[PDB]
Design a binder for this molecule. Structure first.
Ligand SMILES: CCCCCCCC/C=C\CCCCCCCC(=O)OC[C@H](COP(=O)(O)OCC[N+](C)(C)C)OC(=O)CCCCCCC/C=C\CCCCCCCC
Ligand SMILES: CCCCCCCC/C=C\CCCCCCCC(=O)OC[C@H](COP(=O)(O)OCC[N+](C)(C)C)OC(=O)CCCCCCC/C=C\CCCCCCCC
Ligand SMILES: CCCCCCCC/C=C\CCCCCCCC(=O)O[C@H](COC(=O)CCCCCCCCCCCCCCC)COP(=O)([O-])OCC[N+](C)(C)C
Ligand SMILES: CCCCCCCC/C=C\CCCCCCCC(=O)O[C@H](COC(=O)CCCCCCCCCCCCCCC)COP(=O)([O-])OCC[N+](C)(C)C
Ligand SMILES: CCCCCCCC/C=C\CCCCCCCC(=O)O[C@H](COC(=O)CCCCCCCCCCCCCCC)COP(=O)(O)OCCN
Ligand SMILES: CCCCCCCC/C=C\CCCCCCCC(=O)O[C@H](COC(=O)CCCCCCCCCCCCCCC)COP(=O)(O)OCCN
Ligand SMILES: C=C(C)[C@]12C[C@@H](C)[C@@]34O[C@](Cc5ccccc5)(O[C@@H]1[C@@H]3C=C(COC(=O)Cc1ccc(O)c(OC)c1)C[C@]1(O)C(=O)C(C)=C[C@@H]41)O2
Ligand SMILES: C=C(C)[C@]12C[C@@H](C)[C@@]34O[C@](Cc5ccccc5)(O[C@@H]1[C@@H]3C=C(COC(=O)Cc1ccc(O)c(OC)c1)C[C@]1(O)C(=O)C(C)=C[C@@H]41)O2
Lengths: 532, 121, 289, 28
C-alpha cells in the first residue's frame, strides 16, 4: 500500500544520488516495475506527491536529466518511454500535471519535455509518444489545456525545433523572415475538429476553476484561428441568429398583446384575417418553445454539468430553458381550459425580451453589461438577501406583534417595510396605534438600520463588483466569443465541413521513416523589430 | 446603457400590460410608471383589484429590484469611474481646449493675425 | 528578552538567535532545570508572554523550535519524522498550547484586547492553524450546528408565542382549558427559560473576563447584545407578573433583537461573516460619532 | 501522547504530539 513496490532506487533517485541509482540497475534491478499507493496517488485528502508510478517517470519528474538519460540508454534494461501506469498517465502526462504554472517550473518542465522527446525520437522514430491517452482519453496536449497548464500548452502549440534531424517534431514552421515580418506555419493537426477532445473544445468547456482559461486563448495559433473563424462564416450566422430571434420576439409580443379576452380557453378560430394571424402567431410561439426546449435538453445531456457549477457556467442556458419551460406550461394550461395561461405567458415574454442581452456577448463594448448583471445577481444579491431577511422578518414580527390591538397584516407590514428599505416609505405616524413611542422607535431604528446602513452596504459591494469586472473587459469578451464560435461550428456539421477550419493541407517535411507527411497548416505573421 | 435599459423596460412593460389587459391601462402609461420606478419616483400602491394580483406584485417587485437597485447603481458606478478618470488630468484636458480656442479666434479675423505679430521678432 | 522584542525582521531574528544561544548554554550548565516553566508576577510563561504581547516573531520561534544538535534534542519543540520529498512529516510538541493551565497560547491569543497588532496574523502560525482546523472538523462543527439549530427553534417558538398573545383583559391571564392555550403557555415558559439561560451565560461571561469599560463594546459586541435581549425578556416577564399591559413594548424589542441576532451565527461561514462584521464597525465607528 | 526523545537526566519523557505535513519543492 504505502510502500507498494517502493525500493531504495526511488530514495536514491529522490536523494539525487548519481551512483546509487546507477548501482541498483547495474546489479540487475528492473525499473519496469512501478510503485502505487495512497501516498503516490493524486489525492488531495491526504498528503502526497504524484510523480508517476514508473521509476523513469519518478526520475524525470524529480529534475534529473542525466539519470533518466542513463536509464533510457541503459544496456541492462532501458526504461520504456511508452509505459503507462494503472491510471494511464505515461511519462509525458506526468510531466504535464507536475507543472505548477511558474516561470521557473514551466521553463524547466518544457526544457526536459523537449529533451526526453528528442531522445525518444532518436531511439524510436517509428512511434510517436504524444498520441497516447490516459484513462480519461485525453493527450498530454489536451491534459495541459484542460488543467490550466498554460506554460506547457504554450510550449507544445508553438514548438519549433531547428535541428535538421528533428523537424517532424516541430509544430510551428517559420516560412521566411524578410524583416520585422516573419511568416509562420502552425500545425493545427489536433487543435480543431480533431477528436472527442481538442485544445479549443477543452478550453472553451472548462469549469471556470481553471485559472488561465481567460489568458489561455491569448496563445498565438488559437487567437488567430478564432478570429479567422469569426471573420469567415461565424459572424453572419450569428447575425442571422440574432435577427431571427428578434423577429420571433416581435411575433411573440404581438400575439401576446392581442390575446382574446372573452370566454375560456381554447378559443374557436374565428373566420377573419386577424384571427388567422393570431393563430399563426401562437403556433410560431409554441414552435419556438419546443425548439428551445430540445436545445436545452440536448445541451444538458451533452455537458451534464455538476450541480454546483450549473449556475456559474450555464446562466444563459438555464434562462433559455426556463423561458421555454414557461411557454410549455402555458400551452399545457391553455389546452387544459384554464384562464391561468397568461400568468405564465407574461413571465415567458419578459424573460424572452430581457434575454437579448445574451446576444450582447457578440460585441466588445456591450458585453460587460450582460456579464455584470450575471455576477451581481449570483454573488452579491443572493447572499445579501439572507442578511436582509432576518432584519425584515424580525422587525416585522416585532411591529405586527406590538400593534396587533398598512400595518394590519404581516404581509402589509412586510410590504411597507420593504418600501422603507428602498426609500419609498412614508413615516406618517398618524393613526393612534397603541404604544406610539415604541412604534416610532422601532421604525426609526428600522430606517436607519436598513435604508442607510444596509442599502449602502450593498451598493458599495456591487460597486466593487462592477469595478472589478469592468477593468478587464477584453478578457471577459474573448472567452464569450470563443464559446459562441464553438457552438455555432458544432450546430451544423456541414458548416464545419465547408468552413475549411485549417488554412491549408500541405506537406512541409519528411518523416524519419522516409514517407512524406501531409498535415494541415495555418499561416500567420507577426512584427518584432526591437530584436533586430 | 440605454440599449441595456430599454430591453428591460419594454420586456417588462409588454409583460405588465398583457397581464392585466382585462396608471397601467395604456402601454404609454406603463412605460411612464415603470420609468419612474427606475428613477425612484414610483409608488407600489397595489390598490385596485387587477386580475392575477400575485403575479402583478411579483412582476413589479422583480422590476424594482432589477432596475432601481441593480441597474441604476451599475450606471452610477460607471459614471463615477468616468468622472474619476477625467478629473485627475484636468490640466491636459484644459490646455487643448484653450489651444483650439486660440486657433479659431486667430483664424476668424485675418487682420487680427496680421496685427497680432505672432512671432516675437 | 521576550518583551524587548519590537516585531521587526532584524530585531526578531536577533532576539530569537540569542534566545537559542542562552537556552542551549543554560541547558549545558543545568540540564536538571528547565527555565521556560517559570512565570512572572502575572503568572504567564515567556511563551505566554510573547503570545499575549503580540510578539509574533518570538512566538513563531518558540512554537516550531527545532534543534538538530544531537546533545540538544529535548529542547526541540518540533520534530521532523521524515521527508520522502516535497512532503515532510513533522511532529509538534503541543505540550502547553491547549488545555495547559489558566493560560495557554490559544486561550491567550483568542482573549486579546484587539490592541495586539498581530492577533489576526498570530493564528497563521503552523501548529495553531492546524490544531484549530482539526478541532473544527472533529467535534466543534456539529456542536455549533446543533447550537444554531436549537436557537433557530427557540426563535420560532418565541415568535409564535409572541404572535398569538391574548389581547383581552390585563395580565396575568388565566390558563384556558384548551389545546391552544396549553401550547401558548408552554411557549411562554420556553421563552422565559431561554431568557434565564442567556442571562446566566452573560453574567458568568462578564465575571470570567471582567472586560474594561472602554473595551466592553470593541470586543464584546455579541455578548452585550445577547445580554440585552435576555434583559428585555426578563423585564417583560417582571411587568407581566406586575399586572401591567406594558410587557409587549419590551417583548417586541426582545424579539427583533432575537431575530437580528442570528447574524451571530454567520461567523461560522467564510463568505457570510463579513456582513456581520461590517454592521458592527459601521455602527460603532461611523454612525456613533 | 508519545515519547519521542530521551532527557539528559536519562529518564524517558512522554509528551503530546500533533503530526502535520507540508509541501515545498522549490528548495529541492
Ligand atoms: C418566425 C419564427 C419561426 C420560428 C423560428 C425559431 C424560433 C425563433 C427563434 O428564436 O429562432 C431560433 C434559431 C436561432 O437560435 P439561436 O442559435 O440564436 O439560439 C441559441 C440559444 N443558446 C445560445 C442559448 C443556445 O433560429 C433558426 O434556427 C432559424 C432557422 C431557419 C428558419
Ligand atoms: C425549545 C427550546 C428550549 C430552551 C432551549 C434553550 C433556549 C433556546 C436557545 O437559544 O438555546 C441555547 C443553547 C445554545 O446556545 P448557544 O451556544 O448557541 O449560545 C451562545 C451565545 N453566545 C455565543 C453569545 C454565548 O441550546 C442548548 O443549550 C440546547 C441544550 C439541550 C436542549
Ligand atoms: C413581423 C411583423 C410583426 C408586427 C405585427 C403587428 C403590429 C401591428 C398591429 C396593428 C393592428 C391593428 C388592428 C387591430 O387592433 O385590430 C385587431 C386585429 O388585429 C390583429 O388581431 C392582428 C394581430 C396579429 C399580429 C401577428 C403578426 C405575425 C405575422 C408573421 C382586432 O381587434 P383589437 O384592436 O385587437 O382589440 C382590442 C385589443 N387592444 C387594443 C385592447 C390591445
Ligand atoms: C416548532 C413548531 C413551531 C410552529 C408553531 C406555530 C405555527 C402554526 C400556527 C397555526 C395556528 C392556527 C389556529 C389559530 O389561529 O387559532 C388560535 C389557536 O392557536 C394557537 O393559539 C397556537 C399557537 C401556539 C404556538 C406555539 C408552538 C410551540 C410548540 C413546541 C386561537 O385563535 P387565534 O387565531 O390566535 O386569534 C386571532 C390571532 N391573530 C390571527 C389576530 C394573530
Ligand atoms: C431623529 C428622530 C427625531 C424624531 C422624534 C419625534 C418623532 C415624532 C413624534 O414625536 O410623534 C408624536 C409623539 O411621539 C413620541 O413622543 C415618541 C418619541 C420617540 C422619539 C425617539 C426616537 C429615536 C429612535 C432612533 C433610532 C406623535 O404623537 P403627538 O404628536 O404627541 O400627539
Ligand atoms: C420583499 C417583498 C415583500 C412583499 C410581499 C407581499 C406584497 C403585498 C401583498 O401581500 O399584497 C396582497 C396579497 O398579495 C399576495 O398575496 C401576493 C404575494 C406575492 C409576494 C412575493 C413577491 C416576491 C418577488 C421578489 C423578486 C394584496 O391583496 P390582499 O391584501 O390579500 O387583499
Ligand atoms: C434562473 C434565474 C437566476 C433567474 C430566472 C428569472 C426568474 C429571473 O430572476 C432570477 C432571480 C432574480 C430575480 C429578481 C432579481 C434578481 C434575481 O434571476 C434570473 C432571472 C433574472 C433577470 C435578469 O436576467 C439577466 O441577467 C440577463 C442576462 C444576462 C446575461 C446573459 O448571458 C443572459 O442570457 C440569457 C441574460 C431576468 C428574468 O429572467 C426576467 O426576465 C424576469 C421576469 C425574471 C428574471 O431567476
Ligand atoms: C448594544 C447595542 C449597540 C445596540 C442594542 C440594540 C438597541 C440595537 O441598537 C443599538 C444602537 C443603534 C440603533 C439603531 C441604529 C444603529 C445603532 O445597536 C445595537 C443594536 C443594533 C442592531 C444591529 O445589530 C447587529 O449589528 C447584528 C449583529 C452583528 C454582529 C454580531 O456578532 C451580532 O451578534 C449578536 C449581531 C439590532 C438591534 O439590536 C435590534 O435588533 C433592535 C430592535 C435594536 C438594535 O444598540
Amino acid at each position: 500500500s504505502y510502500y507498494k513496490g517502493q525500493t531504495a532506487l526511488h530514495i536514491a533517485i529522490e536523494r539525487r544520488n548519481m551512483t546509487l541509482v546507477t548501482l541498483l540497475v547495474e546489479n540487475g534491478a528492473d525499473v519496469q516495475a512501478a510503485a502505487n499507493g495512497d501516498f503516490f496517488k493524486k489525492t488531495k485528502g491526504r498528503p502526497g506527491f504524484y510523480f508517476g508510478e514508473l521509476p523513469l517517470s519518478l526520475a524525470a519528474c524529480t529534475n534529473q536529466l542525466a539519470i533518466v538519460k542513463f536509464l533510457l540508454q541503459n544496456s541492462w534494461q532501458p526504461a520504456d518511454i511508452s509505459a503507462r501506469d494503472s491510471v494511464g498517465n505515461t511519462v509525458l502526462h506526468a510531466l504535464v500535471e507536475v507543472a505548477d504554472n511558474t516561470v521557473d517550473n514551466t521553463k524547466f518542465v518544457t526544457s526536459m519535455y523537449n529533451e526526453i522527446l528528442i531522445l525518444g525520437a532518436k531511439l524510436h522514430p517509428t512511434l510517436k509518444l504524444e498520441e497516447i491517452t490516459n484513462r480519461k482519453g485525453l493527450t498530454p496536449l489536451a491534459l495541459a489545456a484542460s488543467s490550466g497548464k498554460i506554460g506547457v500548452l504554450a510550449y507544445i502549440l508553438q514548438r519549433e525545433i531547428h535541428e535538421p534531424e528533428c523537424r517532424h517534431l516541430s509544430r510551428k514552421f517559420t516560412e521566411w523572415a524578410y524583416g520585422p515580418v516573419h511568416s509562420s506555419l502552425y500545425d493545427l493537426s489536433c487543435i480543431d475538429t480533431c477528436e472527442k477532445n481538442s485544445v479549443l473544445e477543452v478550453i472553451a468547456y472548462s469549469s471556470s476553476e481553471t485559472p488561465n482559461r481567460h489568458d489561455m486563448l491569448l496563445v498565438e495559433p488559437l487567437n488567430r484561428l478564432l478570429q479567422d473563424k469569426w471573420d469567415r462564416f461565424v459572424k453572419r450566422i450569428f447575425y442571422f441568429n440574432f435577427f431571427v430571434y428578434c423577429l420571433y420576439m416581435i411575433i411573440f409580443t404581438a400575439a401576446a398583446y392581442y390575446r382574446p379576452v372573452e370566454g375560456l380557453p381554447p378559443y374557436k378560430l374565428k373566420n377573419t384575417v386577424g384571427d388567422y394571424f393570431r393563430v399563426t402567431g401562437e403556433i410560431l410561439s409554441v414552435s419556438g418553445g419546443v425548439y428551445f426546449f430540445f436545445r436545452g435538453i440536448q445541451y444538458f445531456l451533452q455537458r451534464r454539468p455538476s450541480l454546483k457549477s450549473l449556475f456559474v457556467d450555464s446562466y444563459s442556458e438555464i434562462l433559455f430553458f426556463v423561458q421555454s419551460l414557461f411557454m410549455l406550461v402555458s400551452v399545457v394550461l391553455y389546452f387544459s381550459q384554464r384562464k391561468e395561461y397568461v400568468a405564465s405567458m407574461v413571465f415567458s415574454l419578459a424573460m424572452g425580451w430581457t434575454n437579448m442581452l445574451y446576444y450582447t456577448r457578440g460585441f466588445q463594448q456591450m458585453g460587460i453589461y450582460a456579464v455584470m448583471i450575471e455576477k451581481m445577481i449570483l454573488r452579491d444579491l443572493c447572499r445579501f438577501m439572507f442578511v436582509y431577511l432576518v432584519f425584515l422578518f424580525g422587525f416585522s414580527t416585532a411591529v405586527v406583534t406590538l400593534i396587533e390591538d398598512s400595518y394590519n397584516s404581516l404581509y402589509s407590514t412586510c410590504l411597507e417595510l420593504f418600501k422603507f428599505t428602498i426609500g419609498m416609505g412614508d413615516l406618517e405616524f398618524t393613526e393612534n396605534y397603541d404604544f406610539k413611542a415604541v412604534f416610532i422607535i422601532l421604525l426609526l431604528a428600522y430606517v436607519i438600520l436598513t435604508y442607510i446602513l444596509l442599502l449602502n452596504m450593498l451598493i458599495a459591494l456591487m460597486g466593487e463588483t462592477v469595478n472589478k469586472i469592468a477593468q478587464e473587459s477584453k478578457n471577459i469578451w474573448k472567452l464569450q466569443r470563443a464559446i459562441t464560435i464553438l457552438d455555432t461550428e458544432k450546430s451544423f456539421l456541414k458548416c464545419m465541413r465547408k468552413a475549411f477550419r485549417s488554412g491549408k493541407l500541405l506537406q512541409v517535411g519528411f518523416t524519419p521513416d522516409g514517407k512524406d507527411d501531409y498535415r494541415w497548416c495555418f499561416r500567420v505573421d507577426e512584427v518584432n523589430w526591437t530584436t533586430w
